[PDB]
């Protein structure tokens, strides 16, 4: 019945080309970046991937901002709970707010 906007654009010579990287391959890049971040650290971006426990990586991250290692190693569960609550808050804010 009513002509679609996409068909009205197509019938006058206005086409849209597809991107080279599909959504699954962009997601594969994102998954590779996330796995290299959480299992190796910053070493995979500056050479080969060097495996390290995540607690030692976060202790290095606190050393990067002028805080010593005992702050992490004495408050590991508190930081884990705060990170999990932050991720849940991002999830709830993305589910509710659409702006």
């Amino acid at each position: 019945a009513a002509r679609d906007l996409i068909c009205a654009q197509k019938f006058n010579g206005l086409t849209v080309l597809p991107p080279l990287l599909t959504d699954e391959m962009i997601a594969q890049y994102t998954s590779a970046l996330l796995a290299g971040t959480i299992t190796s650290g910053w070493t995979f971006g500056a050479g080969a991937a060097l495996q390290i426990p995540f607690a030692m990586q976060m202790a290095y991250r606190f050393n990067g901002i002028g805080v010593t290692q005992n702050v992490l190693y004495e408050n590991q569960k508190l930081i884990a709970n705060q990170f999990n609550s932050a991720i849940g808050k991002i999830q709830d804010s993305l589910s509710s707010t659409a702006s």
Binding site: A46, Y60, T68, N70, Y73, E74
Partner: protein, 106 residues
């Protein structure tokens, strides 16, 4: 400034542009090791000042992260913060004191 840990750069002119030679540092030959976040000695937790604790199976060493240069564990490169029942993954080992054997040796 180039891929890897950046060391230097050198400029060169080019027709309508510039060319940078980025001299950088890349680690080469990895090696597996067993690590611990801290060492409980005499009921006190010891953390490294700079570096990381590694072990080749029997003895523990402390070394910097970007190069395998193992050294024996002393009180000069470790600091004490609290006891050893809070940190998870902590191990039992001894820490050499650089003063007392030289004191009795005199």
């Amino acid at each position: 400034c180039g891929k890897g840990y950046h060391l230097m750069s050198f400029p060169q002119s080019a027709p309508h542009g510039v060319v940078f030679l980025h001299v950088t540092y890349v680690p080469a030959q990895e090696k597996n090791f067993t690590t611990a976040p801290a060492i409980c000695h005499d009921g006190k937790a010891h953390f490294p000042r700079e570096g990381v604790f590694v072990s080749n199976g029997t003895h523990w060493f402390v070394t910097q992260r970007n190069f395998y240069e193992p050294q024996i564990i002393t009180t000069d490169n470790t600091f004490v913060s609290g006891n050893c029942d809070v940190v998870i993954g902590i191990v039992n080992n001894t820490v050499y004191d650089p003063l007392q054997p030289e004191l009795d040796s005199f």
